[PDB]
Amino acid sequence: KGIRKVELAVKWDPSPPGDPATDLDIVAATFLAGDAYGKPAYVVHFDSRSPDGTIYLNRDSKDGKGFGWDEVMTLELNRLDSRYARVVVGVVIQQRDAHRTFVGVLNPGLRMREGYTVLAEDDFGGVLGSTAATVGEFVRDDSGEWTFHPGIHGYDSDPATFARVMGGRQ
């Protein structure tokens, strides 16, 4: 693809007053060249900074209150050390307060772009029964160029489990 820098943005509307809050989190995982579909080298989310500052959450929301994009993450893929050959991005729905799948989130949406070029948009309509989803993959070849592989894949897991398994091959 020749992808250099990606922004992943996610939006949703809040739960009704008095219901448990709806909280989606963006998470990214990096994988090593010698194990691209295996154990994450590290993960980035609202409670876990990148060790190298190249992938970072720009803003979060714990309730979806607010017009426009509620949570945004930047991935400076060009700057990743060559040891990293694959990055997976995903969205989890927090489960601690209530079992909630994408159909139970009001008007969820995502957008991924490189600069001003939109790469993907989705409403999670293919994963309505899931509690988390991977929403995109980037793979770097021997030429050094990052390719984006679209695809939304649903998971039935909670956030902590998802972060460990989100690299699995599809």
Stretch that binds Ca ion, among 17-25, 32-40, 47-55, 132-140 (CB under 5 A): 17-25
Confirm whether residue 71 is marked as ligand binding: yes
Least distance from C-beta 128 to Ca ion, angstroms? 19
Q: Which is nearer to Ca ion, 3 or 75 (CB)?
A: 75
H or E segment and range at residue 140: strand 132-140
Residue 40's nearest CA partner among 86, 91, 81 is 86
Q: Looking at 17-59, which runs of residues are DSSP E strands?
A: 24-32, 42-44, 55-59
93 binds Ca ion, rule: CB under 5 A: no
91 binds Ca ion, rule: CB under 5 A: no
CA distance linking residue 53 with residue 118, whole number of Å? 23
Stretch that binds Ca ion, among 55-63, 101-109, 114-122, 160-168 (CB under 5 A): 55-63
64 binds Ca ion, rule: CB under 5 A: yes
Confirm whether residue 154 is marked as ligand binding: no
Residue 117's nearest CA partner among 28, 27, 9, 6 is 6
Strands 71-75 and 6-13, by their bridges, are antiparallel
Least distance from C-beta 23 to Ca ion, angstroms? 5
Burial (CB count <10 Å: 0-12, 13-18, 19+), residue 135 = buried
Least distance from C-beta 46 to Ca ion, angstroms? 6
26 binds Ca ion, rule: CB under 5 A: no
Chain residues in the site for Ca ion (CB under 5 A) = 23, 25, 60, 64, 66, 70
